[PDB]
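Researcher: I've got a protein sequence and the SMILES for magnesium ion. Could you write out the 3D structure of the bound complex as structure tokens? I'd like something to compare against our soaking experiments later this week.
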Amino acid sequence: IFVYQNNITPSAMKLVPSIPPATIETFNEAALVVNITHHELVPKHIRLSSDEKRELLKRYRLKESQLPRIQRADPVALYLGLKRGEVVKIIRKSETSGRYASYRICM
Amino acid sequence: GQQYSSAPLRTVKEVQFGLFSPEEVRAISVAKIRFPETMDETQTRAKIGGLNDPRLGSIDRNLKCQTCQEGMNECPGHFGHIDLAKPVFHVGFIAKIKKVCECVCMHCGKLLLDEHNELMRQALAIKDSKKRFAAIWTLCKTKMVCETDVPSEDDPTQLVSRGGCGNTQPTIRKDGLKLVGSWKDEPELRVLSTEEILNIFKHISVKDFTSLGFNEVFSRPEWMILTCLPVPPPPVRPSISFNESQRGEDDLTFKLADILKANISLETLEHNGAPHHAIEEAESLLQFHVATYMDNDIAGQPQALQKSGRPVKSIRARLKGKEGRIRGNLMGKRVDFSARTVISGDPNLELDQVGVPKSIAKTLTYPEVVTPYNIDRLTQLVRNGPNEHPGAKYVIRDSGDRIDLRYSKRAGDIQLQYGWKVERHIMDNDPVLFNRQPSLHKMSMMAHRVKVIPYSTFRLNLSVTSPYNADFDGDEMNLHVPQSEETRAELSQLCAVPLQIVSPQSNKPCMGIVQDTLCGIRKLTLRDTFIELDQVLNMLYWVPDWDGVIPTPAIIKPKPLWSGKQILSVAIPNGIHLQRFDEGTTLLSPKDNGMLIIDGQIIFGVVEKKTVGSSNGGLIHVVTREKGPQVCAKLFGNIQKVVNFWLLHNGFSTGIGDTIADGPTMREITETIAEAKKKVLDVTKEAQANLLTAKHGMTLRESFEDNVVRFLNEARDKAGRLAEVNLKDLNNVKQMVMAGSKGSFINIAQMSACVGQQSVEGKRIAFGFVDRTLPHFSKDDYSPESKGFVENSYLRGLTPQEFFFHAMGGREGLIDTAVKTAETGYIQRRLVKALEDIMVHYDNTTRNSLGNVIQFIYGEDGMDAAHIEKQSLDTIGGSDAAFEKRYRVDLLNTDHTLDPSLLESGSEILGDLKLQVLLDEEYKQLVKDRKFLREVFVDGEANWPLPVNIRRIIQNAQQTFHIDHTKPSDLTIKDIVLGVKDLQENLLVLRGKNEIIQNAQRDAVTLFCCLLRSRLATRRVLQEYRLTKQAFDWVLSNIEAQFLRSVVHPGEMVGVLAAQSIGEPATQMTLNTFHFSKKVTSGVPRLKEILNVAKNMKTPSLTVYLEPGHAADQEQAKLIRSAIEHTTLKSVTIASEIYYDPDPRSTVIPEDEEIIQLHFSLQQSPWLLRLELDRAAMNDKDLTMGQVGERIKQTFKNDLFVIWSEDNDEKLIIRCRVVRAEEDHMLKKIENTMLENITLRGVENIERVVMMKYDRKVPSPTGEYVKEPEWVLETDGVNLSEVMTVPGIDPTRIYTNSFIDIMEVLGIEAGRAALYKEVYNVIASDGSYVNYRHMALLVDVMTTQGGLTSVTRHGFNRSNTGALMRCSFEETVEILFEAGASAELDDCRGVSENVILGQMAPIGTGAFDVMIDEESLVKYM
Amino acid sequence: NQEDSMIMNQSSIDRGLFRSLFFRSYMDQEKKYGMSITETFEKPQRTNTLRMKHGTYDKLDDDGLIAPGVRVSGEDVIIGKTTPISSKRDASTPLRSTENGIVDQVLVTTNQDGLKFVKVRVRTTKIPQIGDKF
Amino acid sequence: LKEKAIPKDQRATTPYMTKYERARILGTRALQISMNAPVFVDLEGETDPLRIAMKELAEKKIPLVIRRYLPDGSFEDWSVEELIVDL
Ligand SMILES: [Mg+2]
Ligand SMILES: [Zn+2]
Ligand SMILES: [Zn+2]
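Model: Sure. Here is the predicted complex with magnesium ion in place.
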């Protein structure tokens, strides 16, 4: 993870995908001041293991498509460092049930 | 078709879209269309071997088809063709034909960009058919050379040859229907021949075009260019041939003849003496006609006019929605077995009946099959004839031949045979669909019981006036007659009026007692109201389900008298238990307040809207859930039959006497307006002497007017309140208001006391003339009288000034109304077209036509909206002390156990440690419940709508078992604790033997169970409800079974449900936002704003909450307001001056002579830039000259020498000289960069910042919630990203009505939250209630596709859903054009597709299949 | 009389309260197709292949018009006219199906061209009924 | 495929009958009764096909079977006999 103050030159940015399996993350110091995850409206997102996901699709007779999606750029997806494919489980409170769990596949 | 066909009968399961290969058109063709003629060749007025021609189909009712020899009804028509003299672009693809050229090398047919490019690999990767072609084009368009060699993946120094030529590529532009390129002294310009465009496309590799949007089998790019033009058979272009001598060919026949004529000119021209630059003239003409046949409404070109000056209907124009094939002939249709007449109200009809006039019943029929049961009766209907009421119109023999009973010589001696059908008259009690357009409801169309009556009107029960929205103001309605014993079952078993009684729109009932009955029910149910025997006996007879038992009079000795309450209770059925508390209701009700009904008998309280109307805890809402929809449907009638009869005799009226307010009260009113008039003058003269200090973020005028419009409304409201209070109980207007039958306070107020201030566009009537409202006034007149205040009542009557001003404001109302209906019109339809396909599947999951999950269980609970009522969660509120008192059982403390008076074991129960383990674990979970509920419903709101009315189950138990609140219970501590634990396990929403589904079940029942444990705790079940073992076990079974009822039904078409449940309350909206905290745009315009997902919104605002320990402190808030409120240099500046001061040590300005001395103690430009700042401006924005100075100083840095006066100096001045020819012009630049560019303080965009002392429910140390008002900041600008990171604020609370922004900062999941919040506040502004799930679905739908999906032509209509499905709204022809060119395959699982294909949609009754099991069949017989 | 509907005194209606007259004028002309080929107002009958209406032609006189006394109904032919084709094809005017009354006035004049022009006015007394507006 | 059929053991749908199933079985049977199909119940003076079908349903002598399809195409066959009618 890289916490840059103002900007990263496009020449430096070329080096981010350059070294796989290792994945490099770019974070602006100014954005991190407040933890968005902490906000009233932001519910709890939970990364699901390859198994946890497989089970979900199997248990709901789903194709990866049929699943509600989340952007790779989503503030919470960047926070949890979600890579494409990785499913997130979201637990929010409900006014109908007490709790409700939704799932969002990455893009 | 109508004849027997050997052929197998199948259903369309897929629609394969493709394009015609010219080759196909030739094979498929039955005729080579050769002559632009129609017929009359060799004299004979009969079809020519050229156009039309029998090779295609018959014009005459001939029998001859000459292809299938079948005849007009049976024959569909046969296609022909015209082989075109030169190729032509298909008008509808012209741009995609251009974009494919923009992608490929116009010399070798190679995809300009190879897989050798990394970005090309990224585009080529796209699994999506169209997004691939879009990404490919954006990359290939900027490529202008075909590469022979290119740098390899291995090393860029040693290039690798990828094949293909090295020609340069043209910059393509569209000129009308032609394509022109621009290759590269001076660029080369030549048109691109269709022939050439076609050759390149023929040379495009299979692999290449399949990588582009296309398909090898069904959609090859080359087919986008036409060479063989298919000729549609006559039924597509009908010769409306009137008379023998005359004809009358269709528009399309002319356009085709026009195409044919144009083709032969070109065919002869090129073959014979070709002048070549005349061949390109006749070629462009054939290119025009073929384009203009398919589309006439072309982008900037001449409309191909018909002889008349008429434009010629293109094929595009035919299918273009609202009235085109799709919208007007397929999603909608005119239909047989339908009737429509004027509707009239009837009190003597049962709820679910419909008075059909004899004439209508004698016209509409029903195909009854002759069966042993009916054979006897049917022959008598046939006998009766088509003219007697219970008669028949046709007998249809097995031989598929119709008998017209009106003429048949055998009409009298028809001997029926089993199997044959009798098309008999509609008789009494046949189910029929009754409807009142606009149909924005499930309710707008209901199933009714026929009741053949005389007189030309449809008679309907008055309590069903409400869901139809019908008045008898000349209103008309539709009736539809089902023709199958199956569709009768549909109507009767799903859409009957009794069923629809309780709406899932608002979890409340949609019908209640109205007008005459409501007015009369208040009057009947009173202490004063007593009935003499004579009439009591008649009132009893009128109730049809009367037991024949004369009730014992309430008064016996003086004279036997009965109260209204007593005999109305005759219609209220046994087992109906209702309790309600209003204002000061005691159990010995003083004002006849509230309502108490026991075993279906009234104890106290007047019956009105709150009881007997369409209320959430209604006498109706209860009767349905507690007795049956069939029972409730009867109660409607029975209440009306009695009430209306009593009221017929009691009588009711209204006169001008009821608008007459008592003299001294009129003196008081006149005085209230007079004192309010002087209170305005005082404020008017106050503001004229500049004394009046302006409000924060408001003009002196904005503030003056606010106060004026306030007094003038306060006045009208108070003066009105005087009239209302003066008006006697005998006042007939007050009576209707009291009952709630018609009328409100404002109605009384405007009629008796004062009409009030008139308003246009929020502001009191402005000066349309120069400085005055009418010539009748002097200039600059701001008086109540001049700006539109109406001093008079409607009784006293308006003055001419008052008349016009009221009329002005009145008009604004009719405009708004007319606009609001249009707007909501669209809103309802896009809402409905965006949700059609959403259903609850047999897996309790919410999905669409793709099978994509929206909700994981409908409405996050899996319950049917209809089976829900508001209930309170007792464990949420109150002091922790009172919780303890109400829930704690401690068998280990002498003063905290259950006394043996409660239960039999009471004596032996004390000290049982093992049992106290149960009550300890019980209370430990009860406590857990309270903490959780307060995590969910943070404000301490206890009243939430849930599925089982537990209060009523316990109530009904007490009555059922005649429970004595004296004798001790037979329940054990295990009987309760362990019984309630075991109930929870049987409350199933989802059944599934796996952790995912089981943990999902646990979540669905989470909230309901809190309420269960809360209302079934040991202390409560024994001390409160004094339940037996019997009572309790019954309560338990009832909760279980009643819960299981409440769950959603797989097939529940919740897409449309939700859509209509937002769309219909939208139509009932007044708006925009009153006529004047913040003034946010709300209702219809704000909802339009939401659905569109509009970026530039009318009222963007932030709501910043203060840091925890700062809420009370106004000074802390004042600071943050100051720290975020955007201040510019421009706002504090009076004037910017450029002086010529050549001595840096001396000043030409004598004022500044002091300022130099000091900012020169403790090279420069001779040009001075002097700025004069305003003291008051600096003081409203609490600024210092130094503050301002240092800001200018830091903007230009070491390029501008800045000096300034002190905050004491009589004149505030800043002097600026430049640092180190043509210099004066440089200062004019710097002066604008000072005013316009420089930001002094606060966050940008955040323009006006307001101070709000908002209230707040929060827990007290003692436990109970208490009003803790905190300071809050409101905005006139939005910048979340920055105002969140501001010190002193709460960035765990901060909200923005720009949900677009909250999505961007806090994530899609938190974006969803903000979206629902806004959608809810548009609905709740109008006061109205829509159950969570409806708005939740729309919000969930707009969101599942990771981001904000708009409810527009652009949003949901550009989804991966069906081709036909999407075309059924907004783009139509444009959708279907791409459908063929990209070879789409419609799944046929959307509702639309089946509606178009005339197939049973997989909706409700169609979501499952029915099979006969020969096994179970042979078992029964 | 609930919800913007009203009760009316029938004994008043009898005495002629809110009672109104009604008239409708039907019009026709003998069109000239080219030269000497003219349409003709007559009472037509089954002569070769004429596509005659399903109404009562019997109410028409020899001129092909009703006499202004007769009661007309349903689709009773009120103007009898024929167009020739190279015998006779029907070009008659029936009454409006959805209507009935008594012939009030028949007017036979000439059009500016010098061809037969006719107008037929039909009378009906309409009585305030149960679904009528006020 | 015939993996489409879900077996009797392992069945997740409601053991109760949908409001739509009732309306369709009642209708389907009424229509069949109406076109002279054999009646499995003792029609106690009954003559209306819908009433006869409601009599058939109450006695659970309806020989039909509901194929409840799932979002993927797999189905659970439930019998009219075996479905609880709480409605
Ligand atoms: Mg109206
Ligand atoms: Zn044919
Ligand atoms: Zn090339």
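Model: The pocket of magnesium ion (ligand 1) is lined by residues B 471, 473, 475 (CB under 6 Å). The radius of gyration of chain A is 16 Å.
Researcher: Great, I'll pass this along to the crystallography team.
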